[PDB]
Every structure is written in structure tokens, then in C-alpha cells.
Design a binder for this molecule. Structure first.
Ligand SMILES: *[C@@H]1O[C@H](CO)[C@@H](O[C@@H]2O[C@H](CO)[C@@H](O[C@@H]3O[C@H](CO)[C@@H](O)[C@H](O)[C@@H]3O)[C@H](O)[C@H]2NC(C)=O)[C@H](O)[C@H]1NC(C)=O
Ligand SMILES: *[C@@H]1O[C@H](CO)[C@@H](O[C@@H]2O[C@H](CO)[C@@H](O)[C@H](O)[C@H]2NC(C)=O)[C@H](O)[C@H]1NC(C)=O
Ligand SMILES: *[C@@H]1O[C@H](CO)[C@@H](O[C@@H]2O[C@H](CO)[C@@H](O)[C@H](O)[C@H]2NC(C)=O)[C@H](O)[C@H]1NC(C)=O
Ligand SMILES: *[C@@H]1O[C@H](CO)[C@@H](O[C@@H]2O[C@H](CO)[C@@H](O)[C@H](O)[C@H]2NC(C)=O)[C@H](O)[C@H]1NC(C)=O
Ligand SMILES: *[C@@H]1O[C@H](CO)[C@@H](O)[C@H](O)[C@H]1NC(C)=O
Ligand SMILES: *[C@@H]1O[C@H](CO)[C@@H](O)[C@H](O)[C@H]1NC(C)=O
Ligand SMILES: *[C@@H]1O[C@H](CO)[C@@H](O)[C@H](O)[C@H]1NC(C)=O
Ligand SMILES: *[C@@H]1O[C@H](CO)[C@@H](O)[C@H](O)[C@H]1NC(C)=O
Ligand SMILES: *[C@@H]1O[C@H](CO)[C@@H](O)[C@H](O)[C@H]1NC(C)=O
Ligand SMILES: *[C@@H]1O[C@H](CO)[C@@H](O)[C@H](O)[C@H]1NC(C)=O
Ligand SMILES: *[C@@H]1O[C@H](CO)[C@@H](O)[C@H](O)[C@H]1NC(C)=O
Ligand SMILES: *[C@@H]1O[C@H](CO)[C@@H](O)[C@H](O)[C@H]1NC(C)=O
Lengths: 122, 366, 50, 269, 50
């Protein structure tokens, strides 16, 4: 909120634009990495209602419909253990926690019901 | 977007063209109450006044001199200042002010000025060349005069040498006119230099009594004790305005706060040393100062070869502070896109799980 | 004085941007490693030791 | 008046330790749940302070230096410790600060007072009334120049009391930064006999007197023809301030709870 | 004149710290590669070519 300061700053050059471009590239590559890590299959798989997985009990890593969020018990434990000023703007990520949980559940259901064939093809 | 990308063929995507910021609307300035102005309410209209050779020197204590009540008062005869403008008196501070009040004849008022010389201005009271202050005189013939002439107003007339500025004489020895040493009695070469003027209610201009005061403005290595009356405007509850709470400065939107301060704390700061809460000095209420809405203006638009309709996104800005459907998202206010309840593949990433696309009668959807 | 303040704050911003770029490079390396581990261990059976 | 008391018992100057005292608010800024680091004149933790204890006999109140501020604490009972003296020469040649708190009001005046050898305040006892009444004001004798004057509101406090141990604690901090004579104060109920309490208590500002004079030494004023008297059992402490860094912890309501001296021990560092 | 020296030496220290951070990132990548090669060639047998 100054006038003469901006007039004296505009004479330095393209430092403003360079820093803005660097921060924008960082913000874009963050979402790029988030998509490259989780979003690997373009098909959201769902586990069947029967939990007869050969004796194994995947009732602590799969989503629970009774909870308001679609995260599992371990995911809730992980989220619980971790807790617009003058020129500071925090941009929200593209893929929210709900979409990340959906991708994780899809990968888990694929690994359970298809082994490794869901990655190489159908 | 065309000027930012420096081209005429804008491709499909979201581009950050410019930035948005809510400009302030007012410049409110507040200060505590102005109570206990100064002893000027009684030092000017007092009953008795000292003589010209024994003028009093009342030191002004810690009080804000209200010069507006004196300059705008038409009851006074003359109002002149030296070294400082009368209008800027209420906007400055001083360390010590001495008010010298006395009774002088109407014709001798002209000689009471810096740089003057004569009989009264050199043997009773003298002002320096660099005197900085004001002079105030007013007519008092309606109450200081009496039938038959008054003789209680003594004055010194003859002296052996000139007096220094801001000097008061106490000794009242007789004046020596000749070379013969005076033995304390009058004679051909020894006369009493102290006399008394006569003020009558039937005397015209030049013989009427005029009460003149001398205000001395001096500053040295000491904290200021007398300043001007600081004004206070009316505050606004919720509006992006400029604030000045007793020397502070900034721009933000105020709001009712719940932080219970301490009786001696004035303004609060959060982590990283930033002022986030101040106290109104008048009503003694606590109100936070959040920064005004600001963000980036992103223009969501498809390829130029497809269409020219665009969509504006204000990142981190509420839709109420923006001022053709207006839809509010968790990433910012989006103007120019129709929000649908269906789900499609993300074409133009916006943020917070929302994307835009140019589909179906035909407009940008979110 | 305004020029001195502008120079100091611009140097601070440049230092912050450099630190953020280095940290973002580290985070990108970690994310590439995590994506590789995902694609190998989760979507298959990696014979790579440790 | 001007009386040179001589009937006093000679005792060596006692010493004690101030564990955690002199922690005052460096500014008027509110802070909630944040450990702020400030660098100003504070009292060093676990420092050697001088102890003056009045016995019965023992009425020690000499001229003490005043450099970079002085922390004044007095475990007082029956309203003995009333006022202080401030100045650079104390011989009516230069300006000096006078602070007196008698049974009516806290009179503060800045003139060129002429202080005598042993200035004090005398209070009668059991004058056919069963009530302590003050009748002596032997502090100064003249005042030619004056620059500031303050007369607080009149009030009535008790002047009697006889307990086996002290009940009130009065802590003060006096500084002179750019002519402003800052005064901090805090009171807390204690139950001790001859020891300084071992606890933490924040010191809040009370008044700022812009005297604009340079103070070099100070002196206290205790409560009581020229010989024969009985002084009340009371003691006061004096601690000098030094420029040291302290880490202050503010609670949710904006009050200091504990402090750490930055140069006291490796753990504190 | 002391302020000029302070500014120059501060710029020199900033440049040195930036170069050291970049070299430390390079050496961290090299050390991660070395640890991976250790775990895959010494503690086992890797079928990865070259
Ligand atoms: C797969 O693992 C989950 C998680 O351990 C198992 O759920 C847990 O089952 C036990 C055994 O019944 C529950 O303990 C008891 O449950 C009864 C209700 O049946 C409750 O009244 C008792 O107070 C006690 O808690 C446990 O609560 C339950 N935990 C959860 C989070 O549901 C599940 O049974 C396992 N599946 C199989 C097939 O073993
Ligand atoms: C400054 O003056 C205002 C009024 O001009 C005072 O506000 C009043 O305060 C009294 C006491 O609490 C209330 O009973 C009135 O209702 C208030 N009036 C208004 C219009 O607000 C204010 O208290 C004064 N402040 C100081 C520090 O003296
Ligand atoms: C109390 O003692 C002081 C100090 O001895 C006395 O002050 C002296 O007074 C004499 C006579 O006026 C002077 O010649 C000395 O120069 C003074 N000395 C100092 C250090 O000031 C004072 O007079 C004594 N008061 C009484 C009542 O006896
Ligand atoms: C405490 O001190 C104050 C001021 O030194 C005394 O107030 C004076 O009292 C006398 C006697 O009534 C008056 O003539 C003065 O005008 C008062 N001065 C002021 C400034 O008000 C007060 O009497 C003292 N109280 C006691 C108990 O000694
Ligand atoms: C005396 O003068 C002051 C200003 O100089 C004024 O405020 C006050 O009202 C006057 N007194 C009377 C009784 O009019
Ligand atoms: C925008 O302002 C409205 C009105 O105060 C409020 O209800 C809404 O929650 C605000 N939106 C955000 C994102 O803060
Ligand atoms: C989406 O659903 C909400 C909730 O009923 C409704 O108000 C809104 O009109 C719907 N929008 C569309 C485009 O169908
Ligand atoms: C304080 O200093 C005195 C004087 O040497 C000494 O006798 C005493 O033991 C010291 N006290 C502490 C706690 O250091
Ligand atoms: C006792 O109190 C009364 C009333 O104030 C007073 O007149 C009298 O002088 C006091 N006694 C003495 C000895 O002063
Ligand atoms: C009192 O103050 C005046 C003006 O500051 C000064 O001229 C005078 O010498 C002072 N008196 C004494 C005794 O110092
Ligand atoms: C300031 O303090 C010094 C002592 O350091 C003293 O001699 C002097 O009189 C004081 N006042 C002024 C105006 O220097
Ligand atoms: C702050 O004040 C409130 C209200 O007086 C009180 O309930 C609360 O306990 C206080 N906080 C602390 C930490 O004591």
C-alpha cells in the first residue's frame, strides 16, 4: 500500500515477474508430483461386499462407510498425528484429500482383487 | 491474457493475468479524549494582574494548549504571532510555555513586539530578535477603569541600562540623574523612577487599559509537555479503511474481537511481529485488524480457435468483495462459469477439486 | 532510504525463492522415488533387494 | 526538619539471592501463546542483591547508586516503606525527583530540593488515641526551581499493625530511558519472616513520569527529640539491572508465566 | 564504508551458501544412488542391465 515505493521498484527490472514465474512453476510441479504419485490408474476400483479374502482381514486399511470421510483407520491415525497475510497466499491443491483417499482405495482394491494384472492392463 | 502471453492465439488453459486488491475507502484517525485542556480557562480572565515591571511568569504544566479557542475568539482585540503561523499552532508540540500577563497603556501596546525599542520596551520588558511565540491583547476599559482615575497600576520609567529578554527586576532603588551619589532621598539629581498611569472610563483610544499576554515557545533536551489538540474521526465497523490508532498506521478491515486484553496493553501482535489487534482509545474496546481481500486474477478460457468466452477466477477472494453466474469455490470466486452437478474429466484445472470445460446452449461450465 | 529498504527486501525474497526452489527439487526427487516405489511394489512384485 | 541521627547499631551489609525477579513487560504489546524474545534492561536471574533490614537500633538508609535502572523490592508490613529519593547531586543545585506516599496521597514533585543528612518520616504512637499518627515530614527544606508536580487523590490507609511475619510484598522497577521515568509495580500476598519469596510474578507498568532529568543515585525513605525512637520491623532489597536477553512466555490471556535468561546456563542458552 | 564491506561479504556468503546447497543436493543424489547400488549388488543379485 505505497505509491513512491512502487515507482522506485518498477525501475529494477523483471525481478517481480521472475519470482512470480518461479513460484507458479513450483505450484504447478507440486500438483504434477501429486498426480504422478497417486493417479496411476484411470479406473476407480471398488472392493466387493464379501470380505472372504482367503482368511486375511483387510478391515483396517480399506475405507469405512460409517465414518463421515472415506479414509481408513490407518489414514485417520496418520491425519490426526499431523496438525492471507500481507503478501502471503496459500493456494489449495487440485486433488483434495477425498480424491487422494479415493485413489488409494482404488489402488488397494485393485491390488486385492487383481494382484498385479490391473496395472499392466485390464 | 493476450497481452500477458504476448500473442493472439491463446490456448486452452488457466492464465494468471493480473492481481486484485481492495483499495481503501476512508482514512479514519482516532485518538483518546482531550480532557483537562490547560489552565488557559482561568489565566486569561483572571481578576487581578501584575504590573509591567513585576510581570508574573506562570509555567505551563502538562496540558494540551487549545489554540483554536483563542484564534477564533472575536472578543480579543489583536491576535498576532511571531515565528509560527496561528493555524499550525494546534498541530505542533512544545516543551515549556511561559505566560507573562500584565497591564499596559493602550498606546504602549505597539512597542511590545520583537525588534522594537523605546521607553517601555527597553526598561520594563524586552523581547529578543529570535522570539518565537504569539501576542494577545484585548480591551479592558469597562472594568479596569474607575471614576477619578486609578493609581494602583505602578510602572518603571527610568533605568540606568537596558534589560535582557525574559528578565524581571525586583530591586526598586531610586534613579540617579546626576553625578552626585544619592543617599536614598530625592533631590535635584535624585528622583523616584517608579510612577503610576491613570486609567479613566472616559478616555479614548491610547489611554484605555489593555491586558496583553506573552506566549513563549521554547524547546530543548526534554520531553514535550504541551501539544496541539488531536482530533478523532468516527470509526467504521467492517470496511477496508486506513486506520491510525495513536501513532499506528496500516490498512485493514476491522471487526468485533473477543481477545481480552490487559488494562495497560494497547495493540496486540501475533507471531512474526505483525499487528493484528488494536484497542480503541475512546471506548476501550478490542477489535482485530484483518488485511483486506487480495489475490490473483486468473482467466479460464478455452482455445481462441474454439470460442472467445472467458471465465474470471479471483484466487482466495470471497465473492462478496469482488464487486454472468457467480459461483463460489474453495479456491476462490469464479465468475462466468455455470456450476453443474455432473462429473466429467478435468479439462482446465482450477483448484480445490474443481475444473472447467467448454461444453453444452454453449458456455463454460464448472 | 526507500532504495535501501527495497534492495534488502528484494535480497530477502531472492534468498527465499532460492531456498524454495532447492526444497522443491528435493521434494520432486522424493516424489519420483515414491511414484517408482508405488508402481513397482504396489502394482507388481519388485525383486530389488531392500 | 534537619536532624542527624547517630544512635544506630553498626551491622555489616547483608546479602541475599533473587531467584526469579524483575521480570516486567518490556512493552504494551499483547501476545497470546507465543514465546517472545526481547533484549532490554532486566534483572539477572540468581544475582547477588544487597539486603537492608531494619531491626527494632537499625535504621540504615544510605545513598545508593542508580545505574541502568534499579530493582526495588521490599517485604513490608504496617506500611513502613513509603517513598524514595531520586537525583544526581541531591544538594538543591540540580533538579531531582521526589516521591512520597504518606497516609493521605502519593505526592510526586520535581524540584531542586535540599535534602538533609538522614531524611525520614516520623509517626507518633499511642497519643491518647490508640492510633498511629504521622507528624514529621523531614525530607527537604527548600525548593527554588520546579518543573513537574503531581498530587494524587487523597485516601486513608492504616498505620497500625504488629504481626510475627511479613504479609505484603512490594516490587518496583525504576528506569530512565530518554527522560521518561518508567515505573513498574506488582503486589502479592506472602508469608515469610526474613527471606525473599522464591516464585515468579510479572511486573506491570503503573505510570510514566517525563522528568527529563539525569538520575545518578537514589535513596529510600523509611518510617519511624533528635534521639530515641522505635522503627517498625521492615526490610527492602536493591538490585541493579544489566542488558540481558530474556525469553518471555505469554499465556492465552496475555500474561507472562515464566522467563529464561539467555546467558545463565547452557540449558537456558 | 563498513556498511559497504558488510554488504559485499554478505553477498559473498549468500553465494557460497547457495553453491554449497546445490553441491550438497548433487552429493545427496549421488549417495542415494550409491546406497541403492550397494543394496542391489552387494546384498543381492540385480538383473538390471548396466
Ligand atoms: C478384522 O479386524 C477388525 C479390527 O480389529 C475386527 O473388528 C474388531 O472385532 C473385535 C471382535 O469382535 C471387536 O472386539 C469386540 O467387539 C464387540 C462387538 O462385536 C464389542 O462389543 C467389544 O467391546 C469389543 O470391542 C472390535 O471392537 C472390532 N473392532 C472394530 C474397529 O470393529 C474384525 O472382527 C476382524 N474381522 C475378522 C473376520 O476377524
Ligand atoms: C471519552 O468520552 C466518551 C464520550 O464523549 C466516553 O464515552 C462514555 O463513557 C461513559 C462511561 O462508560 C458511558 O456511560 C457513556 O455512555 C459513553 N458515551 C458514549 C457516547 O460512548 C468515554 O468513556 C470517554 N473515554 C475516556 C477514556 O474518558
Ligand atoms: C549533618 O551532617 C552533615 C555532614 O557532616 C552536615 O553538613 C555540613 O554542614 C556544615 C555546616 O553547615 C558544612 O560546613 C559542611 O560542609 C557540611 N557537610 C556536608 C557533607 O554537607 C550537617 O550540617 C549536619 N546537620 C546537623 C543538623 O548537624
Ligand atoms: C500527606 O501529604 C500531603 C501533601 O504533602 C498533605 O496534604 C496537605 O495537608 C495540609 C494540611 O491539611 C494542607 O494545608 C495542604 O494544602 C495539603 N497539601 C496538598 C497538596 O493537598 C497531607 O495532609 C498529608 N497527610 C498526612 C496524614 O500527613
Ligand atoms: C475564560 O476564558 C476561557 C478561554 O480563555 C474560556 O474558556 C472561559 O469560558 C472563560 N470564562 C468565562 C467565565 O467565560
Ligand atoms: C464469504 O462471505 C460470506 C458472508 O460473510 C460468508 O458466509 C462465507 O463463508 C464467506 N466465504 C469464505 C470462503 O470465507
Ligand atoms: C444441483 O443440486 C442442487 C441441490 O438440489 C440444486 O439446488 C441445483 O439447482 C442443482 N444444479 C443443477 C445444475 O442441476
Ligand atoms: C554476595 O556477595 C557477598 C560479598 O562478597 C558474599 O558474601 C555473598 O556470599 C554473595 N552471595 C551470593 C549468593 O553470591
Ligand atoms: C487525639 O485525637 C484528637 C482528635 O483528632 C486530637 O484532637 C488530639 O490532639 C489527639 N491526641 C493527641 C495527643 O494529639
Ligand atoms: C531555574 O530555571 C531557570 C530557567 O531554566 C534558570 O535560568 C535558573 O538558573 C534556574 N535556577 C537554578 C537555581 O538553577
Ligand atoms: C545529564 O547527566 C550527567 C551525568 O552523566 C549530568 O552531569 C548532567 O547534569 C545531566 N544533565 C544534562 C543536561 O547534561
Ligand atoms: C483467561 O480469563 C478467563 C476469564 O477470566 C478465565 O476463565 C481463564 O481461565 C483465563 N485463562 C487462564 C490461562 O487462566
Amino acid at each position: 500500500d505505497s505509491t513512491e515505493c512502487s515507482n522506485l521498484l518498477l525501475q529494477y527490472g523483471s525481478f517481480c515477474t521472475q519470482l512470480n514465474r518461479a513460484l507458479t512453476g513450483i505450484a504447478v510441479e507440486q500438483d504434477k508430483n501429486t498426480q504422478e504419485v497417486f493417479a496411476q490408474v484411470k479406473q476407480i476400483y471398488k472392493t466387493p461386499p464379501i470380505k472372504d479374502f482367503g482368511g486375511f482381514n483387510f478391515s483396517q486399511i480399506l475405507p469405512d462407510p460409517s465414518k463421515p470421510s472415506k479414509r481408513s483407520f490407518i489414514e485417520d491415525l496418520l491425519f490426526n498425528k499431523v496438525t492471507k497475510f500481507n503478501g502471503l497466499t496459500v493456494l489449495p491443491p487440485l486433488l483434495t484429500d477425498e480424491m487422494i483417499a479415493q485413489y488409494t482405495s482404488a489402488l488397494l482394491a485393485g491390488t486385492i482383487t487383481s494382484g498385479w494384472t490391473f496395472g499392466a492392463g485390464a | 491474457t493476450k497481452c500477458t502471453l504476448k500473442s493472439f492465439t491463446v490456448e486452452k488453459g488457466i492464465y494468471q493475468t493480473s492481481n486484485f486488491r481492495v483499495q481503501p475507502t476512508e482514512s479514519i484517525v482516532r485518538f483518546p479524549n482531550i480532557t483537562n485542556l490547560c489552565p488557559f480557562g482561568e489565566v486569561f480572565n483572571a481578576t487581578r494582574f501584575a504590573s509591567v515591571y513585576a510581570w508574573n511568569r506562570k509555567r505551563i504544566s502538562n496540558c494540551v494548549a487549545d489554540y483554536s479557542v483563542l484564534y477564533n475568539s472575536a472578543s480579543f482585540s489583536t491576535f498576532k504571532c511571531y515565528g509560527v503561523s496561528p493555524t499550525k499552532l494546534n498541530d505542533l508540540c512544545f516543551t515549556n510555555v511561559y505566560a507573562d500577563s500584565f497591564v499596559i497603556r493602550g498606546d504602549e501596546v505597539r512597542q511590545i513586539a520583537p525588534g522594537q525599542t523605546g521607553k517601555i520596551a527597553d526598561y520594563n520588558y524586552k523581547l529578543p530578535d529570535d522570539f518565537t511565540g504569539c501576542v494577545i491583547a484585548w480591551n479592558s476599559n469597562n472594568l479596569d477603569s474607575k471614576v477619578g482615575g486609578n493609581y494602583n497600576y505602578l510602572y518603571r520609567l527610568f533605568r540606568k541600562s537596558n534589560l535582557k529578554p525574559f528578565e524581571r527586576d525586583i530591586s526598586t532603588e531610586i534613579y540617579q540623574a546626576g553625578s552626585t551619589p544619592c543617599n536614598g532621598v530625592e533631590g535635584f539629581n535624585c528622583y523616584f523612577p517608579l510612577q503610576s498611569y491613570g486609567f479613566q472610563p472616559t478616555n479614548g483610544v491610547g489611554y484605555q487599559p489593555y491586558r496583553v499576554v506573552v506566549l513563549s515557545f521554547e524547546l530543548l533536551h526534554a520531553p514535550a509537555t504541551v501539544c496541539g489538540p488531536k482530533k478523532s474521526t468516527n470509526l467504521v465497523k467492517n470496511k477496508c479503511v486506513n486506520f491510525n490508532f495513536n501513532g499506528l498506521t496500516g490498512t485493514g478491515v476491522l471487526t468485533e474481537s473477543n481477545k481480552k486484553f490487559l488494562p495497560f496493553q494497547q495493540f496486540g501482535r501475533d507471531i512474526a511481529d505483525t499487528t493484528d489487534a488494536v484497542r480503541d482509545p475512546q471506548t476501550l474496546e478490542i477489535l482485530d485488524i484483518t488485511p483486506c481481500s487480495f489475490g490473483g486474477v486468473s482467466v479460464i478460457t478455452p482455445g481462441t480457435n474454439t470460442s472467445n468466452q472467458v471465465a474470471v477466477l479471483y484466487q482466495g477472494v470471497n465473492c462478496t468483495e469482488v464487486p454472468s453466474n457467480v459461483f463460489q469455490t474453495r479456491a476462490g470466486c469464479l465468475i462466468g462459469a455455470e456450476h453443474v452437478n455432473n462429473s466429467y474429466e478435468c479439462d482446465i484445472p482450477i483448484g480445490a477439486g474443481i475444473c472447467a470445460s467448454y461444453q453444452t446452449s454453449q458456455s463454460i461450465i464448472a | 532510504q526507500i532504495d535501501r529498504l527495497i534492495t534488502g527486501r528484494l535480497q530477502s525474497l531472492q534468498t527465499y525463492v532460492t531456498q524454495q526452489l532447492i526444497r522443491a527439487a528435493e521434494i520432486r526427487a522424493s516424489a519420483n522415488l515414491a511414484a517408482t516405489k508405488m508402481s513397482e511394489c504396489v502394482l507388481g512384485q519388485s525383486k530389488r533387494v531392500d | 526538619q534537619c536532624v542527624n541521627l547517630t544512635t544506630r547499631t553498626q551491622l555489616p551489609p547483608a546479602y541475599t539471592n533473587s531467584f526469579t525477579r524483575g521480570v516486567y513487560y518490556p512493552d504494551k504489546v499483547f501476545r497470546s501463546s507465543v514465546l517472545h524474545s526481547t533484549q532490554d534492561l532486566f534483572l539477572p536471574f540468581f544475582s547477588n542483591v544487597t539486603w537492608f533490614h531494619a531491626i527494632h537500633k537499625r535504621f540504615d538508609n544510605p545513598v545508593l547508586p542508580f545505574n541502568d535502572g534499579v530493582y526495588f523490592a521490599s517485604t513490608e508490613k504496617s506500611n513502613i516503606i513509603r517513598g524514595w529519593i531520586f537525583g544526581t547531586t541531591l544538594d538543591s543545585k540540580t533538579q531531582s525527583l521526589l516521591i512520597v506516599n504518606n497516609a493521605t496521597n502519593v505526592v510526586i514533585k520535581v524540584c531542586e530540593f535540599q535534602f538533609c543528612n538522614d531524611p525520614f518520616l516520623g509517626v507518633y504512637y499511642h497519643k491518647n488515641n490508640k492510633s498511629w499518627m504521622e507528624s514529621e515530614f523531614r525530607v527537604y527544606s527548600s525548593a527554588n526551581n520546579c518543573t513537574f508536580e503531581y498530587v494524587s487523590q487523597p485516601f486513608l490507609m492504616d498505620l497500625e499493625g504488629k504481626q510475627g511475619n511479613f504479609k505484603n510484598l512490594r516490587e518496583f522497577v525504576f528506569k530512565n530511558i530518554d527522560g521518561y521515568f518508567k515505573i513498574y509495580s506488582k503486589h502479592t500476598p506472602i508469608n515469610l519472616v526474613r527471606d525473599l519469596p522464591q516464585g515468579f510474578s510479572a511486573l506491570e507498568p503503573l505510570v510514566d513520569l517525563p522528568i527529563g532529568i539525569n538520575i545518578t543515585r537514589f535513596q529510600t525513605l523509611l518510617a519511624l527529640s533528635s534521639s530515641g525512637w522505635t522503627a517498625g520491623a521492615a526490610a527492602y532489597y536493591v538490585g541493579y539491572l544489566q542488558p540481558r536477553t530474556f525469553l518471555l512466555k505469554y499465556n492465552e490471556n496475555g500474561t507472562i508465566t515464566d522467563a529464561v535468561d539467555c546467558a545463565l546456563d547452557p540449558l537456558s542458552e
